Structure 1
Amino acid sequence: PVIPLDPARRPVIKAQVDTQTSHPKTIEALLDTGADMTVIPIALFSSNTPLKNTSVLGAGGQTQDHFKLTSLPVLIRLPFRTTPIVLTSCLVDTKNNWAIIGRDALQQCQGVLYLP
């Protein structure tokens, strides 16, 4: 689709995310051109799966413990497209349950920004 940009409304999409560690779930995710890497809520993973420690720089400072990195690829299906986005690795939100589609996924989408 064409998604209009408005400060009062976050640009969101429904995405089916398969962590390959439990059953795929459809979630609402922010579409974010400022994110290098996609973020998935920890809730989407089985309780025992191995994750890696990671450090992330964001607007509030540098966090050492808020995010992890996945061990397995993540598959994402978007409502209009038949082909899964395959992400070799992405971020995992161990706290605030953020779901954010970043430029890794938008590239495999052929997503663009358009400014007339």
Structure 2
Amino acid sequence: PVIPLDPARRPVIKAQVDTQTSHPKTIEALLDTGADMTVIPIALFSSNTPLKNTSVLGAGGQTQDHFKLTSLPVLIRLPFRTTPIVLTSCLVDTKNNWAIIGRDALQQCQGVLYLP
């Protein structure tokens, strides 16, 4: 699907995320070319599973308290695609609660940016 770019309407997609620690769940994800690494909400993980601490430099600035790192790979199924994206590791937003589909995933599903 061509997703047109509009400052007022974020380019979002419904993606099904499998964290491998609880049941797969469909969340709203933001399609993000600025993002090196895909960001999953923590509500998709069980209480038990260990998560590595990590430091992240975003527009806000430095933060060690705010994102964690996955212990296991993550599987993302898009609405159209039958085969799952597999991400060796990705960031876990701990305090907020929506996902960012970053260039790690965008590469695996032959995603591109077109400028006429």
TM-score w.r.t. structure 2 length? 0.99
Unaligned runs of 5+ in 1: none
Deviation track 1:3-60 (CA, whole Å, cap 9, x = no partner) reads: 0000000000000000000000000000000000000000000011100010000001
Whole-angstrom CA distance in 2 between matches of 1:98 and 1:92:
10
Whole-angstrom CA distance in 2 between matches of 1:86 and 1:64:
25
Q: Equivalent residue of 1:64, what SS?
A: strand
Q: Which runs of 4+ in 1 moved over 6 A?
A: none
Note the C-alpha offset of 1:85.
0.1
Note the C-alpha offset of 1:98.
2.9
Q: Equivalent residue of 2:14, what SS?
A: strand
Whole-angstrom CA distance in 1 between matches of 2:27 and 2:96:
14
Note the C-alpha offset of 1:96.
0.9
Unaligned runs of 5+ in 2: none
Note the C-alpha offset of 1:97.
1.2
Q: Equivalent residue of 2:50, what SS?
A: coil
Paired residue total = 116
Whole-angstrom CA distance in 2 between matches of 1:85 and 1:33:
16
Whole-angstrom CA distance in 2 between matches of 1:98 and 1:61:
19
Q: Equivalent residue of 1:106, what SS?
A: helix
Deviation track 1:60-90 (CA, whole Å, cap 9, x = no partner) reads: 1100010000000000000000110000000
Whole-angstrom CA distance in 1 between matches of 2:23 and 2:12:
22
TM-score w.r.t. structure 1 length? 0.99
Whole-angstrom CA distance in 1 between matches of 2:30 and 2:39:
10
The sequence identity of aligned pairs, in percent, is 100
